[PDB]
């Protein structure tokens, strides 16, 4: 704690010379990545000028980035209403509605193949794959009985698999063309998040309300909790998201905690980042996220008068921590946006951040550049 704030300064040592040191071969790459992480933090304290705002109807539930292009993003609502929006285009972005009441989209990834498509998981009970023009291409699975719906979704392209979670305790695993060999139960209650590793292909993670988060091996296990690993918790878990590199698993709870688990001995943790993201009914649950090219963490803060704050000033803001250390390095804040940043996601590109607040979508790029003739 400390080292940065509304008053305290971000920048540590002025090691930029190291780049040329790297040109000489003396200093190693990870130190350089450390220094440029430092650089990005420094310029991130000038992301403060909120670039753009965007509304739509009732509530935000999920966020996703167009992988190839920076300025494009997809977002999913409380009422099955999807939006696709590009910046610097001004062509009044594209919309698609749904039922509006009980059709809450809850998971959303782009199509790795056809950029004009998208996968989606819906409160209707239909993990679907559908176009931005409205035509549904294919349903993949189904509840076939209302009051039992899906909550979690993710996909991998290198392995060509799809995975999805229910509201009771069972997970389903499909191919990109159907062909289901799964639907064995994994948990006792709702599965809030679930994800696949990108750098391997064949161990999986799932998290649930059961105060437990579980790591599976989708080709080797078939025996209904003949799993690979199981990590316990003190409270439930809202999200468990992998690294891009594959070695650092991040986990984020409902009461007050963040945990970093490592490749090395999944059971024990490396470090605890205490920070409040308290759960609540009408709020959208909070989802920590990695930044694809550093060892940073980005989170939304939701103050708690009962959480033992180390810092005396507790505002509604976006915090930025270091992965492999434990403490903080930056805090984004801007009034006129005193809502609670439920979701936050960086680009795969590295120059942009999106925030999903209640009834609001925010874009945080830098501005105020010099000019040409």
């Amino acid at each position: 704690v400390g080292l940065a704030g509304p008053q305290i300064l971000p920048p540590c040592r002025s090691i930029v010379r190291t780049l040329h040191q790297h040109k000489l071969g003396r200093a190693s790459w990870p130190s350089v990545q450390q220094g440029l992480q430092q650089s990005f933090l420094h310029t991130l304290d000038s992301y403060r000028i909120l670039q753009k705002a965007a509304p739509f109807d009732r509530r935000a539930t999920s966020l996703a980035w167009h992988p190839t292009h920076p300025s494009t993003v997809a977002v999913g609502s409380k009422g099955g209403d999807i939006m696709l929006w590009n910046f610097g285009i001004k062509d009044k972005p594209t919309f698609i509605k749904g039922i509006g009441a009980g059709g809450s989209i809850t998971g959303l990834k782009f199509n790795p193949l056809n950029t004009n498509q998208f996968y989606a998981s819906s409160m209707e009970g239909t993990t679907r794959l559908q176009d931005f023009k409205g035509n549904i291409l294919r349903v993949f699975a189904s509840s076939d009985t209302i009051n039992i719906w899906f909550c979690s979704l993710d996909v991998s392209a290198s392995s060509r698999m799809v995975v999805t979670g229910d509201n009771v305790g069972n997970v389903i695993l499909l191919n990109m063309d159907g062909k289901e060999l799964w639907n064995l139960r994994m948990h006792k209650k709702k599965v809030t998040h679930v994800a696949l590793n990108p750098c391997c292909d064949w161990f999986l993670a799932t998290a649930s309300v059961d105060q437990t988060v579980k790591i599976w091996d989708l080709r080797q296990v078939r025996g209904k909790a003949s799993f690979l690993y199981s990590l316990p918790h003190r409270h439930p878990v809202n999200a468990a998201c992998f690294s891009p590199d594959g070695a650092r698993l991040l986990t984020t709870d409902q009461k007050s905690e963040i945990r970093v688990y490592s490749a090395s001995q999944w059971d024990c943790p490396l470090g605890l980042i205490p920070h409040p993201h308290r759960h609540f009914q009408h709020l959208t649950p909070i989802k920590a996220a990695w930044h694809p090219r550093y060892n940073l963490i980005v989170v939304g803060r939701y103050p708690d008068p009962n959480f033992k704050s180390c810092t005396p000033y507790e505002l509604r803001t976006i915090d930025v921590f270091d992965g492999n250390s434990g403490k903080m390095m930056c805090q984004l804040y801007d009034p006129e946006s005193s809502g609670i940043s439920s979701l936050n996601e960086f680009n795969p590109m590295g120059d942009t951040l999106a925030s999903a607040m209640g009834y609001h979508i925010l874009i945080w790029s830098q501005e105020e550049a010099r000019t040409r003739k």
Binding site: S39, T43, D245, D351
Partner: protein
């Protein structure tokens, strides 16, 4: 549509590692040397070194250790590559045919893990029970050395200590035992663990943990009769063994960090120590007798032996001779005498071996004859820093010692000289400013001109300097093209570093200037916020300041642009015009960057190499007077260098030792899609590229149409390797790549590593097979195999000889093809 060919012009010269032992025969004393892809095997003689073998591996050697299991009549060699291919090899000779047999091979990559900060570490138990590897934090990998472990199967053990500095297996232990130094919030400590194979886990070590110096950085495993371990730090040397503790703090070593070590006596009575200033010390262990016949340590002593090239590694051979393997300077054979010379030195150089590395910059000039290009490189660093002049006819290399670190170079024909940015280290003096460690080019010029510039000396808050801070002093040297004497030296301001340099004409002005971009350096700034562009004119043996331009950032790069100056400052690319009153005026700017390090131009097009936005293709608009972002590579890559192949093709190199080739998306139906550069070529070079440049060394055959490749771009590396990239047609590409496949079916790979795996694109984010690049080295390797193997290689091949129809290819046809290809470098 873009097809490219890469070839080695000069193999790497820097030494990454070196060891001694008995590899070629039980009676021979052998020296093994690693130069980044090459393994060199020599026999030590009374006079020097006899070359016995040189091989290439499909991999960057990170570890090189000899060992002799039970039942073996001579030593085996363990090699581990950067891609974590492990292999155990054996030397085989029969007649004049020499083969290195692969005794064992396997990939020990784990699915997941962050590579550590101090890099791969590899050690082998003295009793040849196991290999130990430090690859990822928190983990220790063990390969049990069973005879059946021909796959080098391994297991992992948790390390509670996540930040290991160094580790070694101990001698004289009934159980395998590691001793290591680690860092934690409480400081640095040294500890040990035994290694239980039965349980595949650590057990408690023989002696308890002890605190060590904050900069404890190397461990030396002392053999019997001493046993125990020595810990080397910045100010102290300690020895630990059981209840035995002995530490010394000799002041002589505090001035420079010790970075490598080697044992002189088999019983461990003497060690060599090498520092960053090239100084070589003798470490002496005094024995103490014990009534039970054991020996304990009585004392430690350090003795200055002298100076060498700055050593990455040292190896005592025999008869007082040491090999000094350097990466920053030439390697050497040196003799140590028992008695000193007139200057008090015990060191005599016997032999020197050329090192071009680090090549930080270079350029091609027809120095001697028109059409005969020669490459002038800024080579080396600190006291080893030099210029190196290279020409063909294999190569002739002239060395110009500078005794300081070069940074950039350009050539100025009209003045018949070169401008060279350089820097030296100075330390605070007794009463004043700072003082140099030795004379060098910036302090031995014929004449000098300190910068009397006062552009922003007024209204500029100075930043204070406390007693103890060392300083870098940058200079621009003007050097004669013929004699390479230091003609003039211009010293820049205190704390300002010069980064980029160009010689050019500007605007309608007929004068030719040297232009330098700089940066103000301060310890607390995450990035520089102040800098200058400075335009000098050379005349009468000196530089006169014609103009300056102050800016708020580091001028990382500059390039000539249609008589205008294009320059990269912090996150901006800025174009300046040269007005009639001889001043710089901002013409235009582009901003969508994090940190623009590299620029190259062709016509009205600009290619920008970014710290983080890997590459950007810009166009200047003469009828609009502004930039447009034409396209961008949306795949992230931490760049180190870039180049323009032609109007449509853009080359890049990045920090994970790969190259890529971008093109415009030909199949784009929208401006948005058109803005996406497509990485059409990918290749794992195995080298860190620092510079590309257009030109050639081979004499150009004016009017030589119907050749395989077109264009020539040379590139230089940290390891001093130089290579050539050229363009290909689709058909030639297909031909040579099929040839590569069949050669791969025929060629014996050292360590049983697949060529495809080695050249496969590889970052921490993604792994993909190679495309669009011909391994020219592999192609040239066709000419060195026997004729039956060639016939096999060309067996069942349809080949288009000259211009015509397809037919069966014969070995001689392919020999002709490859011989023509070899002559491009």
């Amino acid at each position: 549509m873009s097809y490219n060919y890469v070839v080695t012009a000069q193999k790497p010269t820097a030494v990454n590692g070196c060891v001694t032992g008995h590899f070629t025969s039980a009676e021979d004393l052998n020296l093994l040397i690693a130069k980044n892809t090459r393994l060199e095997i020599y026999v030590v003689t009374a006079e020097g070194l006899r070359p016995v073998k040189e091989v290439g591996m499909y991999g960057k050697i990170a570890v090189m250790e000899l060992f002799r299991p039970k039942g073996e009549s001579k030593d085996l060699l363990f090699i581990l590559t950067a891609k974590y291919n492990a292999c155990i090899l054996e030397y085989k000779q029969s007649g004049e045919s020499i083969d290195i047999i692969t005794r064992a091979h396997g990939n020990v990559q784990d699915r997941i893990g962050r590579p550590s900060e101090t890099g791969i570490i590899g050690i082998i138990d003295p009793e040849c029970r196991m290999i130990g590897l430090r690859l990822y934090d928190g983990l220790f990998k063990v390969i049990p050395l069973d005879r059946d472990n021909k796959e080098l199967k391994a297991f992992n053990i948790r390390l509670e200590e996540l930040h290991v500095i160094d580790v070694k297996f101990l001698y004289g232990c009934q159980a395998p035992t590691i001793c290591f130094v680690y860092q934690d919030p409480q400081g640095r400590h040294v500890k040990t663990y035994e290694v239980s194979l039965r349980e595949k886990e650590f057990n408690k070590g023989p002696w308890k943990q002890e605190n060590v110096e904050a900069e404890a950085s190397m461990v030396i495993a002392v053999p019997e009769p001493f046993g125990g371990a020595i810990i080397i730090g910045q100010e102290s040397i300690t020895y630990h063994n059981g209840d035995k503790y002995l530490a010394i703090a000799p002041p002589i070593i505090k001035q420079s960090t010790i970075v490598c070590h080697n044992r002189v006596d088999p019983n461990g009575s003497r060690y060599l120590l090498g520092d960053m200033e090239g100084r070589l010390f003798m470490l002496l262990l005094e024995k103490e007798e014990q009534m039970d016949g054991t020996v304990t340590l009585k004392d430690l002593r350090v003795e200055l032996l002298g100076e060498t090239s700055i050593a990455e590694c040292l190896t005592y051979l025999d008869n007082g001779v040491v090999f000094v393997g350097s990466r920053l300077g030439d390697s050497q054979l040196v003799k140590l005498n028992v008695d000193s010379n007139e200057q008090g030195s015990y060191v005599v150089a016997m032999e020197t071996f050329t090192n071009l590395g680090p090549i930080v910059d270079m350029c091609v000039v027809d120095l001697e004859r028109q059409g005969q290009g020669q490459l002038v490189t800024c080579s080396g660093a600190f006291k080893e820093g030099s210029l190196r002049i290279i020409r063909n006819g294999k190569l002739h290399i002239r060395t110009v010692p500078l005794y300081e670190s070069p940074r950039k170079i350009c050539y100025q024909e009209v003045s018949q000289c070169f401008g060279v940015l350089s820097s030296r280290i100075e330390v605070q003096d007794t009463s004043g400013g700072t003082t140099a460690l030795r004379p060098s080019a910036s302090t031995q010029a014929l004449s000098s001109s300190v910068s009397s510039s006062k552009l922003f000396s007024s209204s500029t808050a100075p930043h204070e300097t406390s007693f103890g801070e060392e300083v870098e002093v940058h200079n621009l040297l003007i050097i004669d093209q013929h004699t390479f004497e230091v003609l003039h030296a211009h010293q820049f301001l205190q704390n300002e570093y010069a980064l980029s340099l160009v010689s050019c004409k500007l605007g309608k002005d007929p004068n030719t200037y040297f232009i330098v971009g700089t940066a103000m350096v301060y310890p607390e700034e995450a990035e520089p916020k102040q800098g200058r562009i400075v335009v000098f004119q050379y005349s009468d043996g000196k530089l006169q300041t014609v103009a300056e331009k102050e800016v708020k950032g580091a001028v990382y790069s500059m390039v000539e642009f249609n008589g205008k100056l294009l320059a990269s400052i912090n996150s901006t690319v800025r174009l300046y015009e040269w007005t009639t009153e001889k001043e710089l005026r901002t013409e235009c700017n582009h901003y969508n960057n994090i940190m623009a390090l590299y620029l190259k131009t062709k016509g009205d097009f600009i290619l920008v190499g970014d710290l983080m936005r890997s590459v950007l293709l810009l166009a200047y608009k003469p009828m609009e007077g502004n930039f447009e972002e034409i396209a961008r590579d949306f795949n992230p890559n931490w760049m180190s260098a870039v180049e323009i192949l032609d109007d449509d093709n853009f080359l890049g190199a990045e920090n994970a030792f790969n190259l890529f080739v971008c093109q415009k998306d030909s199949a784009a139906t929208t401006d948005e899609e058109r803005q996406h550069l497509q990485e059409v070529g990918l290749f794992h070079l195995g080298e860190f590229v620092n510079v590309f440049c257009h030109g050639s060394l081979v004499m150009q055959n004016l009017g030589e149409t119907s050749t395989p490749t077109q264009g020539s771009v040379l590139f230089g590396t940290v390891n001093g390797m130089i290579g050539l990239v050229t363009s290909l047609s689709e058909s030639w590409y297909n031909l040579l790549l099929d040839m590569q496949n069949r050669l791969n079916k025929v060629i014996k790979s050292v360590g049983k590593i697949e060529h495809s795996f080695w050249r496969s694109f590889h970052t921490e984010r993604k792994t993909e097979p190679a495309t669009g690049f011909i391994d020219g080295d592999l192609i040239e390797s066709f000419l060195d195999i026997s004729r039956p193997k060639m016939q096999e290689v060309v067996a069942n091949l349809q080949y288009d000889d000259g211009s015509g129809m397809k037919r069966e290819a014969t070995a001689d046809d392919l020999i002709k093809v490859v011989e023509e290809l070899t002559r491009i470098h």
